């Protein structure tokens, strides 16, 4: 769990304190606000609603025909996908100290306090060699900036989170 | 202004001129071992406009001087191959015509309008039959450009559109599988732009009426 290269300490990505430069996927989902789940449901209902509204505005074959259940289900799955991506990005920018993250900061503080009390490592221990840990951290560093393009999440318990 | 010239017509086979015949060549099955004959004349009589004459015989007998052939008996004429030496255009542009009009007296024979244009293959031909409606009298039969059917070796193929920006030659030929003499008198072939909708028979042919329009 010993880092191999030097990393920035308490770097400020915004106007809020840094919680985790490269938070884990389970970490990001666990630190998710109810508003983010509201966003997920909003998108999950919006794509089918968007399809229905587009059908109402301009029917495909002239006559108004509601889309078949297959299109509704595909739109529901894609809506859950886009909502989950937006929620993950919002939680990440909370971790990056860009938006308001006071409650997340307090939960993070209590969490590593409990972990240190239990006698564990701060960001986990891995199945990967330290070189692979560094490669994973360098690949997944700030990968949320490309949410428009590709999905990529940190599934490696690497120590390169930019904290003390 | 100084833009490329735009026009509603382009004469392909003009005839009606002292030279005329220098613009076209002929090909019968004498290129094969066949006995069909082709010959192009030039008639310039009075009380009318001078025309070309395309006659001959189309004996379908096989060439008993060789064996690799299977079917013979053609006779055609076409415009001279487009001279593209170093600097000129290269071919014809038919991107603003959509039609080709030709004025001709016909007979019982079944002629084909043969067009050669740019194509990846070599022997591809765009050909549409020349529907002679009135035999013995002149008719300005119009054939839409985007109705020619692509044929290679005489076989209908994947119908891809003609490359109207690059057209080489236009001609009339006989591939009719019947014996006997043939004749066809043409006096022009031109590609004509889109005509607006009309609701009269023609100015060249008319029927008795009240003649509402004021006489000149």
């Amino acid at each position: 769990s010993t880092p191999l290269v030097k990393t920035s300490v308490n770097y400020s990505y915004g106007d809020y304190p840094l919680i985790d430069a490269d938070p884990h996927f389970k970490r990001v989902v666990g630190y998710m606000r109810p508003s983010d789940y509201g966003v997920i449901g909003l998108a999950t209902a919006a794509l089918p609603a968007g399809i229905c509204f587009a059908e109402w505005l301009d029917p495909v074959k002239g006559k108004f025909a509601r889309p078949s259940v297959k299109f509704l289900r595909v739109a529901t799955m894609l809506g859950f996908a886009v909502g989950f991506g937006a929620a993950y990005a919002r939680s990440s920018l909370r971790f990056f100290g860009v938006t308001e993250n006071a409650r997340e900061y307090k939960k993070d503080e209590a969490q590593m306090a409990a972990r240190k009390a239990a006698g564990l490592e701060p960001y986990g221990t891995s199945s990967l060699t330290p070189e692979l840990q560094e490669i994973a951290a360098k690949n997944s560093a700030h990968s949320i900036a490309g949410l428009f393009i590709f999905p990529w999440f940190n599934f490696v318990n690497h120590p390169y989170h930019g904290r003390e | 202004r100084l833009r490329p010239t735009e026009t509603t017509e382009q004469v392909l086979v003009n005839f009606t001129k002292p030279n005329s015949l220098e613009t076209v060549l002929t090909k019968c099955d004498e290129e094969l071992g066949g006995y069909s004959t082709v010959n192009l004349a030039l008639e310039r009589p009075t009380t009318g406009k001078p025309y070309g004459r395309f006659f001959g015989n189309l004996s379908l007998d096989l060439p008993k001087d060789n064996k690799m052939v299977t079917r013979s008996g053609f006779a055609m004429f076409r415009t001279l191959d487009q001279p593209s030496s170093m600097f000129k255009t290269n071919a014809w542009n038919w991107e603003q015509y959509r039609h080709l009009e030709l004025r001709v007296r016909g007979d019982r024979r079944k002629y084909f309008v043969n067009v050669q244009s740019a194509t990846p293959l070599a022997s591809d031909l765009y050909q549409h039959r020349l529907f002679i409606q009135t035999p013995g009298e002149w008719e300005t039969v119009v054939i839409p450009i985007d109705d020619f059917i692509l044929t290679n070796k005489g076989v209908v193929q994947e119908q891809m559109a003609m490359d109207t920006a690059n057209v080489y030659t236009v001609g009339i030929g006989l591939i009719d599988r019947q014996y006997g003499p043939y004749n066809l008198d043409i006096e022009y072939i031109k590609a004509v732009a889109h005509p607006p909708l009309e609701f009269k028979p023609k100015k060249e042919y008319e029927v008795e009426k009240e003649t509402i329009l004021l006489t000149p």
Partner: protein, 276 residues
Amino acid sequence: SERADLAWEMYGLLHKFYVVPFADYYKAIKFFAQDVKRQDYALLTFQQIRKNHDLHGQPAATSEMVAFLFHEFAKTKYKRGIKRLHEVVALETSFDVNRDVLNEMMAAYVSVEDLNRVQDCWAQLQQLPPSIGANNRSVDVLLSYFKDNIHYTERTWQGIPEFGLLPTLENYEQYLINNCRTGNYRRALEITKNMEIDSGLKPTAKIIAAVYNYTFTEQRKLEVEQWAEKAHPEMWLELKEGDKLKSLCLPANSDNDNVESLLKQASADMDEEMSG
């Protein structure tokens, strides 16, 4: 219709085993098209005549089938068959194009809405002498293609006298439809009232019911049934129980949209109701 596929196999054995008379081709083409549901076999039956004539030497197909088979294609809006059959016609060394083929070929293109091919076939019909050429069938298709253009419908009507023709009952009906579907309810009545004076062709039930059907004003629909009670009393009464009259009209608070846009939607719905 369910067993239409089965008729195809039995047709094949009838020709492989027994020599089939050429006159039977007409019945099979009319059967495998105009009879139950299937039109793919109509083309293949026509293609069967072609293949035997080229290779085996069987007698060639006549232009009567292509004229008929275009008409059958212009009923199901079969875009694939029209393109297939056209290029077969364009390279035919046995039969030729005449008045009848162009008329039904033009009608085939109106069904698939081809503004170019429709004008192309009209140029070929037009450039022919009126002796053999533009007939009432030509006008019947030409008016039906200008169904929503009042300007070209009218100039088509003056076209009929120029070609040397007298309009027919089937010719008048589409003209009455075209005037009605473009909001000219009042002009339609004068045409129907004065048609018997001008031409001597007494209006029929398929004429009067057409005018009532395509008049989309509740008062203008009433003026249609004002002369009918006192000029055609007997022949109306058989339309009330036949359910021929249909009372489709325009909405109430519909002045938000164009009146001309309403007439398109009203007539489009009415076309389906008269299609069967």
